[PDB]
Design a protein around this ligand. Structure first.
Ligand SMILES: CCCCCCCCCCCCCCCCCC(=O)OC[C@H](COP(=O)([O-])OCC(O)COP(=O)([O-])OC[C@@H](COC(=O)CCCCCCCCCCCCCCCCC)OC(=O)CCCCCCCCCCCCCCCCC)OC(=O)CCCCCCCCCCCCCCCCC
Ligand SMILES: CCCCC/C=C/C/C=C/C/C=C\C/C=C\CCCC(=O)O[C@H](COC(=O)CCCCCCCCCCCCCCCCC)COP(=O)(O)O[C@@H]1[C@H](O)[C@H](O)[C@@H](O)[C@H](O)[C@H]1O
Ligand SMILES: CCCCC/C=C/C/C=C/C/C=C\C/C=C\CCCC(=O)O[C@H](COC(=O)CCCCCCCCCCCCCCCCC)COP(=O)(O)O[C@@H]1[C@H](O)[C@H](O)[C@@H](O)[C@H](O)[C@H]1O
Ligand SMILES: CCCCC/C=C/C/C=C/C/C=C\C/C=C\CCCC(=O)O[C@H](COC(=O)CCCCCCCCCCCCCCCCC)COP(=O)(O)O[C@@H]1[C@H](O)[C@H](O)[C@@H](O)[C@H](O)[C@H]1O
Ligand SMILES: CCCCC/C=C\C/C=C\CCCCCCCC(=O)O[C@H](COC(=O)CCCCCCCCCCCCCCC)COP(=O)([O-])OCC[N+](C)(C)C
Lengths: 168, 50, 81, 89, 469, 64, 59, 183
């Protein structure tokens, strides 16, 4: 009843040298488990786009004379820098769920939180407001969508049962 | 400033000067290449759509 | 030998006969689509033949292989000369 | 499959063998897409599925946006010239 | 993160003025650079040729596709670094090579259309993505509206692309009629024995292949390439070729194909002998596009063509890109300038270029020797690795005609040098203004890749071995 | 060795700056800090490709 | 002292030759459905289209 | 009651006739008028086969927008056009008489799976056999055709609708990319 998977799914099928937690992480989990070195990459990307434009016109100016670009482009550079920083942030932090990068301080937290909600009796992943067929379809859509970060952004907001874990 | 332009074989090719875009040279039937008279010269447009 | 062989006939199979061979064959594949300044109708009646000629060519092939080789040599003759 | 193949082949030869105007090219191109639809939709019916109808409802849209794009291309061609020629572009 | 760019910039370009277009293109260039720098750690996802099917049997993400997906952004940075940056700061160089308002939108819509084919699994993603990129070529061609040749070229390209789009849709519909599925892996090597599929799968191939310049229908593309302006045509010659060729090479639907082998031979013949007596430079250059896109149906005949293809595609894209940028540099030194959209038209016009500067002819010499496969250059190992696969899998007459085609082609590659190292009579003694710094650093880097890529050849083979096997 | 693999890519960078000066009809040393910029950039490319090859070798070692 | 420095190089080339023969055999080796396609969802089995579904359709 | 039998083969003959009147007409508007006739013969066939929904979608967009679009273009534009004269178009006849035969027979070849090349063609015509229609009582709600298209475009193929957004986006940007001449 609304949490039975009823499809067949690989179990602990690691994608790297490290054990996976999760086959698609929910978006709240990715924003939860990301390291401070990841917020680093967000900040370096918000800094690199306006400084990148001012540098790239220091090379060759647009009107022949070196003038600073307007604040109008520095705002859009800051926005798209947050965009690249968030793309790199989601991309790093969800490689850590796949077991393809170094997976030490998050396998412990995912022992901890899953065990801490097995004690409170509720579902291990959460009750969506979807019929289970829509959960299957909506997570065949969001499976492995982090490849293709170069084309389109797609995320997990669906909260479906299966994640490639041991039993459920 | 050369007397005979070559054409990647032993052939004579036309040295395209300003003098190839005339009303005489317009509508001479020929392949899409080895041909002069472009439709868009600053001398051929003659301030079109004025 | 220095004139009828060394400069005469070994340049016919060398850089003199092949210059004339490529001159003729290039001139024919250039002049494939010379006239008909209506280039849309000229290229559009060409797309039909090249899904008809291939389509008959394969029919001729899978009954006997040998009877497409002169067809292909004759297509090279009508194309390059 | 007869009506689709016939619209496709005859529309195709109506595209190929014109020399009179430019619009017969456009409308023969549009009826070729109709002829592809007439074959696809009957294969949807006879196999009992929507997925040929899925490709149908997508190619309706692509035929639409195709016409919108290509007639803006024609108005580009006509703005600079005076009159679209009989023999073609 | 293309669409994160496109949705943002379309609102950004809607409100900016006509003077702001250069700096808009500069912004998009730097954005693509940082998408390549900060997000290129996604190579780790595959380690043993691991392939993902994403959006539900709809897209297919593997590593061949990741490499093409990275290659297209790199060449787009080189293309967009042209429209962003002035060549010289003169009156002429502002009225030449002006970017339109909607041009930077249509590039990225085309890259969306080109990426959704190499990543494509379903036929409906194939059809929607060939349509997206075909529209974008219809409109990248026609955006210079006030040009007679460009409008005629866009109108020709429209109807020919329309016929080949309906031929592809007919093949897709027909494969659907004989088998219920749309995906290519419903084949899974048991169908093809017990099922006559050869005619469907070739007509699907030939539908895309004729869009690219397969040589019975080569005459229309050469006309479009010669008629567009000289900067639209570097993009619209690179992009559809590499996008669909990596499609047709990723999904080997025509093995042992006799139609493909004939048209491969016919391509290698008529390209190398068509470029021989030609006086226009974009022509010569487009038949060099044709023979090199006909070392492609060859690998398309093969099975397991992912070293030969990928190495030759990035070879060809760098070499292509570099020689167009060389003649874009060469237009300053020529004596006659016609036709504002297309300033150098004849290869007779770049005479005596060594007496103007020598290092641009040094650059031109290394690229033209890289096209003809000269062994210490990067363009050599491309033909070497085609031939280590052609002969590997039984194509012996194909190999002989490949060799003869390379030899006949070198005859019109070397015409560029025969013209460019000659006496001119009017040498330059002092130029007052100098060419833009970054836009010549890009060509210097693209040279030093060509002349020094055999250094890293061996690293690439080991990397390749890990990540595709 | 890592060090020669850095020095060679830095030499490729010095060649890029040199040839880019020589297309612009400048002298050899025109903006002599630009050699430092190109050397550091191409040396960083050598860092990247060196580390990718290291990790690829280790993945091959773990398959036995 | 030179025959040994040749035996080292010829071992270093026979190792590369065996490396190639392996990595050319590892390409043609057939691959699982879980490595080649979608890693999770390892079955090829559909259960496609379940709204008006009929009991007795499985086989 | 078997007057009501040949209804499909009738519309096939009418489509043949209607394309003959497409490609042989004097005015450029007479050709699009027979073209909207062709769309409505098609929509009659699509109702006839068992698809009532599509026929009305074809009326909505094919004698809907793109008709009005073509009629509109032919109004506010001048286009020279010659007539179908024998002195300019009889030269195409021996190619048409080959390509009709070859393209029709080959377009009827690939519906078959034998390997004889005469049993392939003769399976296209050798079908006069009446399918038997049983009643199964398994379906409970009237999920007709349009519901299932709205379920598959929106869940199973949401990406095709979402790339489709970019295509219609491009169909808006393109005519403004061309036909404006900003400033
Ligand atoms: C930066 C971050 C990106 C924006 C984040 C905003 C969403 C958020 O933070 O909400 C948290 C919030 C957290 O709630 P929760 O209690 O922790 O758990 C969620 C429940 O499980 C959910 O309950 P459930 O488990 O039962 O599942 C049911 C759920 C099921 O929902 C779904 O399954 C939807 C799945 C679709 C995912 C869409 C991905 C986006 C695709 C981008 C386009 C790709 C183009 C490709 C073309 C080629 O239904 C919904 O809740 C739908 C809510 C609809 C609200 C619509 C809001 C519209 C905002 C649009 C903004 C677009 C412009 C932004 C950029 C500027 O999540 C939600 O409630 C649902 C949000 C779904 C909205 C999707 C909006 C996508 C727009 C982003 C795309 C552009 C940026 C990339
Ligand atoms: C094996 C070895 C046996 C070799 C047999 C033929 C070798 C012949 C050979 O390479 O000289 C080639 C001719 O050849 C080809 O025109 C093109 C050379 C490619 C021919 C391919 C070799 C065919 C082997 C068939 C088996 C030299 O052309 P070429 O100077 O007259 O041609 C012209 C002409 O002289 C003037 O336009 C200029 O000097 C310059 O434009 C030049 O290009
Ligand atoms: C655009 C407008 C759209 C127009 C639509 C209307 C028509 C559309 C159809 C045309 C579509 C476009 C046509 C494209 C060309 C067709 C491609 C084609 O020939 O495949 C043929 C099918 O062999 C027929 O059985 C071919 C026989 C076909 C029957 C011949 C025709 C009968 C004419 C009667 C007179 C074979 O290919 P292939 O080289 O892979 O086949 C080889 C070869 O057959 C074997 O020997 C090899 O061993 C094997 O490896 C295999 O690969
Ligand atoms: C993409 C780049 C590569 C394309 C081909 C790829 C090769 C593989 C990777 C290459 C890695 C590239 C790293 C970037 C290299 C950074 C670098 O050396 O400083 C730049 C080149 O800066 C780009 O030109 C930046 C290059 C283009 C990026 C544009 C936006 C910044 C050297 O200019 P430069 O000193 O002569 O420029 C001088 C100098 O700035 C001053 O004297 C004057 O102000 C100025 O007028 C001019 O004379
Ligand atoms: C700090 C940046 C400053 C700004 C620079 C901006 C853009 C730089 C773009 C390109 C620079 C060249 C990098 C080449 C990477 C090749 C990766 C690869 O060999 O691919 C292999 C497979 O290839 C193939 O099948 C065959 C390709 C054959 C290439 C033929 C030409 C090569 C010769 C010159 C190229 C190498 C020159 C090195 C110069 C130091 C897959 O491995 P992979 O996908 O994991 O490698 C990417 C990992 N990554 C993203 C972290 C770098």
């Amino acid at each position: 009843s609304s949490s039975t998977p009823l499809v067949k799914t690989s179990v602990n099928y690691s994608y790297g040298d490290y054990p996976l937690i999760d086959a698609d992480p929910h978006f709240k989990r990715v924003v939860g488990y990301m390291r401070p070195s990841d917020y680093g990459v967000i900040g370096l990307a918000t800094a690199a786009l306006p400084a990148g434009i001012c540098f790239a016109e220091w090379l060759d100016p647009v009107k022949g004379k070196f003038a600073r670009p307007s604040v109008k482009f520095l705002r859009v550079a800051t926005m798209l820098g947050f965009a690249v920083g968030f793309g790199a942030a989601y991309a790093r932090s969800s490689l850590r769920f796949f077991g393809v990068t170094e997976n030490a301080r998050e396998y412990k937290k995912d022992e901890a939180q899953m065990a801490a909600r097995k004690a409170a009796g509720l579902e291990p992943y959460g009750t969506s407001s979807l019929t289970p067929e829509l959960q299957e379809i909506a997570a065949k859509n969001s499976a492995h969508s982090i490849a293709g970060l170069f084309i389109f952004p797609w995320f997990n907001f669906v909260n479906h049962p299966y994640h490639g874990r041991e039993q459920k | 400033q050369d007397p005979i332009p070559s054409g990647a074989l032993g052939q004579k090719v036309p040295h395209v000067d300003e003098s190839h875009q005339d009303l005489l040279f317009r509508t001479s039937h020929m392949v899409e290449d080895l041909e002069t008279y472009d439709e868009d010269s600053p001398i051929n447009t003659s301030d079109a759509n004025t | 030998i220095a004139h009828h062989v060394d400069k005469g006939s070994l340049y016919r199979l060398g850089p003199v006969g092949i210059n004339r061979l490529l001159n003729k064959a290039s001139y024919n594949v250039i002049n494939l689509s010379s006239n008909t300044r209506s280039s849309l109708s000229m290229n559009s009646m060409l797309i039909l033949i090249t899904i008809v000629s291939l389509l008959l060519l394969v029919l001729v092939m899978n009954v006997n292989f040998i009877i497409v080789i002169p067809v292909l040599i004759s297509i090279l003759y009508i194309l390059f000369s | 499959m007869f009506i689709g193949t016939i619209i496709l082949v005859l529309s195709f030869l109506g595209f190929v063998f014109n020399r009179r105007n430019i619009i017969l090219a456009f409308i023969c191109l549009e009826t070729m897409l109709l002829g592809i639809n007439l074959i696809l939709l009957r294969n949807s019916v006879l196999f009992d599925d929507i997925s040929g109808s899925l490709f149908a409802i997508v190619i309706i849209i692509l035929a639409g946006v195709e016409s919108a794009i290509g007639l803006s291309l024609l108005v580009s061609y006509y703005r600079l010239r005076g009159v679209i020629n009989s023999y073609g572009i | 993160m293309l669409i994160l760019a496109i949705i943002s910039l379309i609102t950004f370009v809607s409100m900016s003025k006509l003077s702001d277009n250069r700096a808009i293109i500069r912004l998009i260039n730097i954005y693509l650079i940082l998408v390549l720098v900060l997000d290129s750690f996604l190579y780790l996802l595959f380690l043993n040729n691991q392939t993902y099917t994403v959006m539900g049997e709809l897209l297919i993400f593997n590593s061949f596709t990741f490499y093409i997906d990275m290659l297209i952004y790199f060449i787009m940075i080189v293309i967009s670094s042209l429209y962003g940056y002035n060549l010289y700061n003169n009156n002429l160089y502002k009225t030449l090579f002006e970017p339109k308002k909607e041009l930077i939108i249509l590039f990225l819509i085309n890259i969306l259309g080109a990426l959704l084919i190499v990543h494509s699994n379903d036929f409906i993603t194939l059809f929607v993505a060939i349509e997206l990129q075909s529209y974008s070529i219809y409109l990248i061609t026609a955006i210079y509206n006030s040009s007679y040749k460009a409008s005629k070229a866009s109108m020709l390209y429209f109807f020919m692309g329309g016929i080949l789009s309906i031929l592809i849709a007919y093949s897709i519909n027909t494969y659907y009629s004989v088998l219920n599925s749309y995906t290519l892996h419903s084949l899974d090597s048991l169908i093809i024995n017990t099922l006559d599929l050869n005619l469907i799968l070739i007509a699907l191939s030939l539908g895309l292949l004729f869009k690219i310049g397969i040589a019975p229908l080569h005459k229309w593309l050469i006309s479009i390439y010669e008629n567009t302006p000289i900067l639209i045509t570097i993009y619209i010659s690179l992009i559809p070729k590499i996008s669909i060729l990596s499609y047709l090479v990723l999904s080997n639907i025509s093995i042992n194909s006799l139609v493909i082998s004939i048209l491969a031979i016919l391509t290698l013949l008529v390209g190398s002998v068509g470029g021989l007596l030609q006086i226009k430079i974009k022509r010569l250059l487009a038949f060099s596009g044709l023979t090199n896109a006909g070392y492609m149906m060859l690998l398309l005949l093969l099975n397991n063509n992912e070293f030969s293809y990928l190495y030759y595609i990035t070879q060809y894209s760098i070499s292509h890109l570099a020689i167009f940028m060389i003649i874009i540099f060469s237009i300053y030194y020529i004596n006659y300038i016609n036709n504002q959209y297309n300033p150098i038209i004849y290869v007779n016009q770049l005479k005596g270029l060594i007496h103007d500067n020598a290092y641009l002819v040094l650059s031109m010499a290394i690229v033209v020797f890289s096209f003809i496969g000269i062994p210490p250059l990067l363009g050599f190992f491309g033909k070497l690795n085609i031939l280590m696969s052609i002969l590997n899998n039984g194509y012996y007459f194909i190999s002989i005609v490949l060799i003869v085609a390379s030899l006949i082609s070198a005859l019109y590659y070397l015409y560029l040098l025969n013209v460019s190292i000659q006496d001119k009579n009017n040498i330059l003694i002092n130029s007052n203004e100098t060419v833009s710094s970054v836009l010549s650093y890009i060509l210097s880097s693209l040279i030093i890749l060509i002349t020094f890529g055999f250094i890293y050849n061996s690293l690439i083979i080991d990397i390749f071995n890990v990540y595709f096997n | 060795a890592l060090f020669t693999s850095l020095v060679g890519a830095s030499g490729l960078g010095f060649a890029t700056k040199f040839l880019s000066n020589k297309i612009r009809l400048k002298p050899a040393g025109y903006y002599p800090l630009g050699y430092v910029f190109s050397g550091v950039a191409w040396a960083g490319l050598g860092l990247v490709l060196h580390n990718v090859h290291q990790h690829s070798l280790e993945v091959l070692e773990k398959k036995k | 002292d030179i025959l040994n420095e040749e035996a080292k190089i010829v071992q270093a080339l026979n190792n590369q030759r065996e490396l190639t023969i392996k990595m050319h055999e590892l390409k043609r080796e057939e691959k699982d459905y879980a490595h080649s396609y979608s890693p999770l969802f390892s079955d090829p089995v559909p259960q496609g289209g379940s709204i008006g579904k009929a009991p007795g359709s499985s086989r | 009651m078997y007057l009501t039998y040949y209804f499909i083969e009738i519309t096939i003959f009418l489509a043949i006739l209607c394309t003959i009147f497409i490609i042989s007409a004097k005015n450029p508007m007479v050709s699009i008028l027979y073209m909207i006739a062709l769309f409505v013969i098609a929509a009659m066939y699509l109702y006839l086969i068992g698809l009532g929904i599509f026929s009305l979608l074809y009326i909505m967009i094919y004698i809907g927008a793109i008709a009005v679009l073509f009629l509109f273009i032919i109004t506010l534009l001048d286009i020279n056009s010659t007539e179908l004269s024998v002195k300019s178009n009889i030269r195409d006849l021996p190619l048409v008489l080959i390509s009709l035969i070859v393209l029709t027979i080959s377009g009827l070849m690939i519906y078959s799976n034998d390997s004889i090349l005469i049993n392939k063609l003769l399976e296209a015509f050798g079908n006069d056999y009446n399918t038997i229609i049983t009643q199964d009582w398994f379906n409970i709600e009237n999920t007709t055709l349009l519901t299932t298209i709205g379920n598959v475009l929106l869940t199973n193929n949401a990406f095709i609708l979402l790339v489709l957004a970019i295509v219609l986006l491009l169909g808006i940007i393109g005519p403004i990319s061309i036909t404006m001449k900003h400033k």
